[PDB]
Amino acid sequence: VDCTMYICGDSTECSNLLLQYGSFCTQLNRALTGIAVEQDKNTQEVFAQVKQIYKTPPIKDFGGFNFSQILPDPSKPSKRSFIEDLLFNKVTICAQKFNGLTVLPPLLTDEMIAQYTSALLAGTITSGWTFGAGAALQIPFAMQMAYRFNGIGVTQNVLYENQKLIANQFNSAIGKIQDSLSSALGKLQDVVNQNAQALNTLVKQLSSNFGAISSVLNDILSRLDKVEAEVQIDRLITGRLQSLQTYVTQQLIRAAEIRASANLAAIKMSECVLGQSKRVDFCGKGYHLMSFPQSAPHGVVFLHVTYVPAQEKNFTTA
Amino acid sequence: SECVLGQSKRVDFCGKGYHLMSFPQSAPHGVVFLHVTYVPAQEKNFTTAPAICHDGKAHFPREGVFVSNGTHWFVTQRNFYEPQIITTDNTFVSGNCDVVIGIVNNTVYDPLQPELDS
Amino acid sequence: VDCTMYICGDSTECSNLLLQYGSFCTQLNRALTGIAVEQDKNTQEVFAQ
Amino acid sequence: PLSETKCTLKSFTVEKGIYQTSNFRVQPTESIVRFPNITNLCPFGEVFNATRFASVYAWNRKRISNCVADYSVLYNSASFSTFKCYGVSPTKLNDLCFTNVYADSFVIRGDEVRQIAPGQTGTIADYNYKLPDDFTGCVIAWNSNNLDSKVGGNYNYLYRLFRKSNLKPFERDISTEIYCYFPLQSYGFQPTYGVGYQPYRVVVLSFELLHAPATVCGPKKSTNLVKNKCVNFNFNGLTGTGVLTESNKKFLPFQQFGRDIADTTDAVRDPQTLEILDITPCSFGGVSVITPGTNTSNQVAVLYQGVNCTEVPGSNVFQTRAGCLIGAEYVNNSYECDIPIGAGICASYQTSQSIIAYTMSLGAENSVAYSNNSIAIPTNFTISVTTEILPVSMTKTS
Ligand SMILES: *[C@@H]1O[C@H](CO[C@@H]2O[C@@H](C)[C@@H](O)[C@@H](O)[C@@H]2O)[C@@H](O[C@@H]2O[C@H](CO)[C@@H](O)[C@H](O)[C@H]2NC(C)=O)[C@H](O)[C@H]1NC(C)=O
Ligand SMILES: *[C@@H]1O[C@H](CO)[C@@H](O[C@@H]2O[C@H](CO)[C@@H](O)[C@H](O)[C@H]2NC(C)=O)[C@H](O)[C@H]1NC(C)=O
Ligand SMILES: *[C@@H]1O[C@H](CO)[C@@H](O[C@@H]2O[C@H](CO)[C@@H](O)[C@H](O)[C@H]2NC(C)=O)[C@H](O)[C@H]1NC(C)=O
Ligand SMILES: *[C@@H]1O[C@H](CO)[C@@H](O[C@@H]2O[C@H](CO)[C@@H](O)[C@H](O)[C@H]2NC(C)=O)[C@H](O)[C@H]1NC(C)=O
Ligand SMILES: *[C@@H]1O[C@H](CO)[C@@H](O[C@@H]2O[C@H](CO)[C@@H](O)[C@H](O)[C@H]2NC(C)=O)[C@H](O)[C@H]1NC(C)=O
Ligand SMILES: *[C@@H]1O[C@H](CO)[C@@H](O)[C@H](O)[C@H]1NC(C)=O
Ligand SMILES: *[C@@H]1O[C@H](CO)[C@@H](O)[C@H](O)[C@H]1NC(C)=O
Ligand SMILES: *[C@@H]1O[C@H](CO)[C@@H](O)[C@H](O)[C@H]1NC(C)=O
Ligand SMILES: *[C@@H]1O[C@H](CO)[C@@H](O)[C@H](O)[C@H]1NC(C)=O
Ligand SMILES: *[C@@H]1O[C@H](CO)[C@@H](O)[C@H](O)[C@H]1NC(C)=O
């Protein structure tokens, strides 16, 4: 926000009055800039956990597991997956722009974020957890799944002996995720709603008189002489500056909430995508096998894959 | 707690690589954790298979991975190439050979055999 | 908090004066309602596992 | 730009970074004026130079409208004595247009004149003429002891002495039923009275500034109109700075202005050609100075945020999606991000040295050579010791 263009606009007369309050516009601009740099920090620490941009092979022989909905779509230049396209459609200015408010582009583009998710997913399916520790050591996919099973205390023969069933279950579950997202993204939507609603409030507070004869500052400057105008303009300045301080304080608290959510997502990226988790319910319900990251507008979707026990029988035990 | 008072299984929580241990150092207004981690190096390609078919039994590794050097099959630990002969003591049987995609044929040694022979 | 009953109380005269400040009472009640819904969310996510 | 960063950072060294310094704003090439084209001079003469005034209980509202005024005649001629203008300045009054003007006229004691202001009480205010709390207008009055008295007394100037309740603002009540007393009483005016008991003629010009087309305006003369160019303007008093554009907004024949969510005026009807014009503002944005560290170089590049490179008033000029970048050269190579400009572009000091701007590399690109029967196993290790620094406390203050 250009604090001077918000409070005073084009008027030099108001700008001279506003200077008598000193640093407050600098404090406001500095706070909003700090929030803005933190949004690039948040995206960097969530998505840029991978050292190299891994590419998947041309032959997708992953043992019956069909990642086509979550790997990059070859038919588009945007390099988003099918599910990432579903996610972007399932969330996605003049009045703000003209009144001193400006919205800055993110440093990483959506294509760059999709290129990091592509690298993370390619590394995962080609090399398992090894690309998090060090080099991407290739291993056949059924064997990394067999060591996921061994991690959850299920002996790896259970994987190989039931492999075609496990592949069919996985493929089917991805299909249900596709249909669910085609029918879902409340947390991301709420953040966009709150920020748009806060800006609409900040703009509409320009209509408020705050006790002055008018809210339109060029009325007063077309209509009262200086010493009488200065009282009216000091009323407008006071109330507009209090509207700005309210906006920037609520943005500092929203910034902390999103910062916490970005820290959590960076932990989930490390512990569920770059690794297998022994932490209960941290990577979905059931015993964690693996997770896949997908980009979403302003956020991340983790597709958590978990082993859920079924068809139990009673036995006498000793 | 989780890096100094303990060893962490949590990936990237106590540095890059597999966590061994960490050391705390004081700093002005804050703390420096020196994180010590094992980072794997100098990897080699090997042919691999999920199971060995022997006498119609499917053998699986107990605590390792099956690899081959171009002529012979070995069992080795996943994170450091220490090749060992495939034996009844480092493999376990489950079922016949037909159910596993990609089973390979090699002998599985029984140490009781040459002992009974001697 | 009813921002109007807090600032003005029964007075219509004060209420008309207060309207000249515009959205501020709506912002306040909206913030306190968001805080309120978050407390049910906190209890839900802790106990309804 | 480097001096401007030094001065906004309040420091003689500047460290490597991108710093928002100041805001760019394009400026008005000329000051348009557009007004009603009304020739009829306003008939204020037949109030200030009426022979005999009304009684203040029966104060008379002459409507003045569809005319051109000049209140500097009424003011600067200064035969008057009091000229209190409420809600409008006596001077800017000549620069403004009004929807109607109502001239309210009466005679009272030079003492009781002090009651005729918005938010007042007393004999005249309570029962004869009440000015509203949000009144816009000028109370003009002058001594009339030359006309409104005589030896043996004048008795022409009645005022209401009693009412069952005070007047509402601008209420007129000429009723005469007995209140016991007759409800009216009159000033006995004699020449020999002191300054406060002598008669004074009062004319109160009640202006109004409604959304209607203004029918009274001051003497200023309209200019020509220019378009697709930045200008200052006055349109019947609507004043601002903007790039007047031929509007396709379909105003209905009664409408005169169109408005933004902030109640800035978004479009205006021309007061003479009656066409509709958009008033999008003359363009603006933040200015950020990309700088290497001042211990490296004084050479700097400047980003005009959101501004299009056609607009900024130069050996290299590049249009990022973040804005126009001047003084850094776009190189088709890609590197690690040094100073973040935005939208995939970063800038760095590189070779003969200058500021390059470039698309950042996310990392080196690798194909993992996955195969259904190939595994890689490490034959060695390295022991890595890495530092993680965390804040724990901050300086305790009271
Ligand atoms: C490991 O091997 C890969 C090649 O894959 C192997 O050979 C195939 C023919 C097939 O038998 C697979 O099952 C094997 O896994 C090596 O990758 C290639 O390396 C060369 C340089 O020597 C490079 O020019 C190629 O581009 C690489 N291939 C691809 C697809 O990019 C890899 O170098 C070997 N790694 C180690 C550590 O030995
Ligand atoms: C992976 O799954 C997709 C479906 O999600 C399969 O896509 C089909 O591919 C064939 C050609 O091989 C087409 O004729 C079908 O129309 C495709 N179906 C859809 C719904 O797109 C794909 O074949 C699968 N691949 C593997 C290796 O399992
Ligand atoms: C694979 O490893 C085995 C060792 O386990 C190699 O076999 C030995 O080869 C040497 C000659 O190079 C002989 O002297 C030994 O007697 C062999 N031992 C056994 C048990 O056969 C084998 O050569 C290796 N293959 C390759 C291609 O390197
Ligand atoms: C792996 O070993 C088994 C034996 O343990 C092979 O199976 C035999 O194959 C022959 C034909 O080549 C049949 O006549 C026998 O009846 C099979 N025996 C059994 C027990 O099924 C198998 O073919 C070998 N496979 C490879 C690829 O070498
Ligand atoms: C920068 O501004 C120019 C206008 O000065 C834009 O040019 C117009 O672009 C549209 C398409 O978007 C064309 O239909 C017009 O004919 C163009 N006008 C002229 C005079 O060339 C240009 O698109 C802007 N570019 C950016 C990146 O903002
Ligand atoms: C590996 O893939 C090839 C086809 O490219 C197939 O013929 C072979 O049987 C596969 N090997 C295993 C172990 O699945
Ligand atoms: C009143 O009339 C006299 C001429 O008799 C003139 O000088 C004066 O300006 C007039 N005043 C107004 C307010 O019209
Ligand atoms: C006002 O001026 C316009 C030309 O700009 C002219 O067409 C119009 O007739 C004038 N108004 C009147 C009432 O004559
Ligand atoms: C300035 O740069 C030189 C290298 O050119 C370096 O030796 C010196 O320490 C730097 N000074 C500071 C204060 O960074
Ligand atoms: C960058 O590449 C484009 C083609 O994509 C070319 O036209 C342009 O001249 C190149 N610029 C430089 C500085 O190399």
Numbering used by the authors:
A (entry chain B): 736 to 827, 850 to 940, 944 to 1078
B (entry chain A): 1030 to 1147
C (entry chain C): 736 to 784
D (entry chain A): 295 to 473, 488 to 621, 639 to 676, 689 to 735
Paper passage:
S glycoprotein trimers protrude out from the viral membrane and are the major proteins on the viral surface, making it the main target for vaccine design. Sequential cleavage of S at the S1/S2 site followed by the S2’ site within the S2 domain exposes the fusion peptide (FP), which mediates host-viral membrane fusion, allowing entry of the viral genome into the host cell. Overall, the S-trimer structures are similar to those previously determined for B.1 in situ, and are similar across all variants.
Gamma (P681), retaining the proline at position 681, shows cleavage at levels similar to B.1. In addition, the Gamma variant differs in the NTD next to D138Y, in the receptor binding site in RBD (next to E484K and N501Y), and in the HR2 helix bundle, all of which are known to be heterogeneous in S structure. Of note, B.1 which appeared and became dominant early in the pandemic, and from which all variants tested here are descendants of, removed an interaction between K854 and D614, which may also favor these transitions. In addition, our structures show that residues 852–855 at the end of the FPPR adopt an α-helix conformation in all the other variants (Gamma, Delta, and Mu), indicating that it is the Alpha A570D mutation that favors the helix-to-strand switch.
